[PDB]
């Protein structure tokens, strides 16, 4: 049974609603972006309107089969009419092809879904800006002031600093980064580009990447190994025993493995700078974690909500303790008394 964040009052619609079977009363399910715990039931057996980006559309066809006619992309930053209900569909700065969702009901409240965002200043100017909003829908997964990370823009210098020494060094060295969903693509793309090599990968990854509308592609990705010096492999195989057996199959190519896990915020980020970031280390194998974020710190989710100044807000993640809810309620009361809103 489908829990209440996940409907929209005063319509027919549900959103990342898709693993409760037929949702009584549902004419139309929204799918803000592709990441498996959001699309969990869907398939080429799926026979209701899905509503969603181009991106998202392109995945769902190529990836899970849903059959076309039931796949309704919609344009961002237009205003659609879907069963009658104004919508709009807003970049939300998570992975390629996820959206928020604005909704203007037919009684006038005005209702904001960010789905799973990375906040940002940009988005106090899109159309956002135009007018009020009653209810949000929250993605909380970082909503505590411990959870401080860099801005993507610091961590690929990093990564590209990194690699590019480490290669210039030793030309015989391999780069490795780990991926198990859509999202971070900048990680392995701007290491490849300072390097002047496409990323190589499996045939099924090449397939995911070919759906995302990324701007000459063609030009920066193969399914050819032996040619690349950047591997994607999956995250589970990003661990010595994984990586060792890995330098084996390139054929003595290389000599040298050099590895990345873009991970979340972790506990090292309550000490470390990004600049002091060393790796874990056996042999000729090195791996580094990279705080790598497509979700808001509690910095850049606190600015958005005291911009925004919601009536009420809905968390969307951190749900299932009481504890998890007391503490999110507090911090969202502080923001109010602090702005006046
Ligand atoms: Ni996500």
Same mark, same amino acid.
């Given at each position: 049974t489908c829990p209440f964040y996940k409907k929209i009052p005063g319509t027919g619609f549900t959103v990342?609603?898709? @693993?409760?079977? +037929? +949702? =009584?009363?549902?004419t139309a399910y929204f799918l803000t972006h592709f990441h498996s715990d959001h699309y969990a039931?869907?398939?080429? !057996?799926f026979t209701f309107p899905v509503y969603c980006s181009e991106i998202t559309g392109n995945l769902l066809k190529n990836?899970? !089969? +849903? @059959?076309? @006619?039931?796949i309704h992309p919609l344009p961002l930053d237009t205003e659609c009419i879907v069963n009658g209900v104004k919508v709009v569909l807003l970049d939300? &700065? !998570?992975?390629?092809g996820a959206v928020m969702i604005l909704f203007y009901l037919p009684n006038g409240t005005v209702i904001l879904h960010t789905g799973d965002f990375r906040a940002?200043?940009?988005? =106090?100017?899109?159309?956002?800006?135009?007018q009020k909003v009653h209810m949000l829908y929250l993605?909380?997964?970082?909503?505590?002031? =411990?959870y401080t990370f860099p801005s993507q823009q610091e961590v690929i210098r990093f990564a590209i600093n990194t690699a590019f020494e480490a290669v210039t060094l030793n030309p015989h060295a391999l780069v490795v980064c780990g991926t198990?969903?859509?999202?971070?693509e900048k990680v392995f793309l701007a290491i490849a580009d300072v390097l002047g090599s496409k990323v190589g990968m499996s045939q099924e990854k090449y397939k995911t990447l070919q759906?995302? &509308?990324?701007? =000459?592609?063609n030009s920066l990705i193969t399914?050819? #190994?032996?040619?690349?010096?950047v591997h994607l492999l999956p995250? #589970? @195989?990003?661990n010595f025993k994984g990586l060792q057996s890995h330098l084996k199959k390139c054929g003595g190519k290389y000599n040298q493995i050099l590895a990345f896990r873009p991970t979340?915020?972790?506990?090292?980020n309550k000490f470390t700078r990004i600049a002091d970031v060393i790796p874990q280390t056996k042999g000729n194998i090195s791996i580094y974690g990279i705080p790598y974020s497509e979700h808001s710190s509690y910095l850049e989710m606190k600015r958005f909500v005291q911009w925004l100044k919601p009536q009420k807000i809905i968390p969307?993640? &951190? +749900?299932?303790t009481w504890k998890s809810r007391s503490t999110m309620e507090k911090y969202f009361r502080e923001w109010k008394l602090e702005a006046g809103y």
């Open positions: 990342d609603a898709f @693993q409760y079977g +037929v +949702v =009584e009363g549902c039931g869907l398939s080429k !057996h990836k899970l !089969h +849903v @059959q076309e @006619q039931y939300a &700065n !998570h992975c390629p940002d200043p940009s988005m =106090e100017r899109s159309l956002l800006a135009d993605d909380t997964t970082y909503c505590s002031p =411990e198990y969903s859509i999202g971070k759906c995302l &509308n990324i701007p =000459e592609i399914t050819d #190994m032996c040619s690349s010096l995250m #589970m @195989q990003i979340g915020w972790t506990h090292s969307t993640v &951190n +749900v299932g």
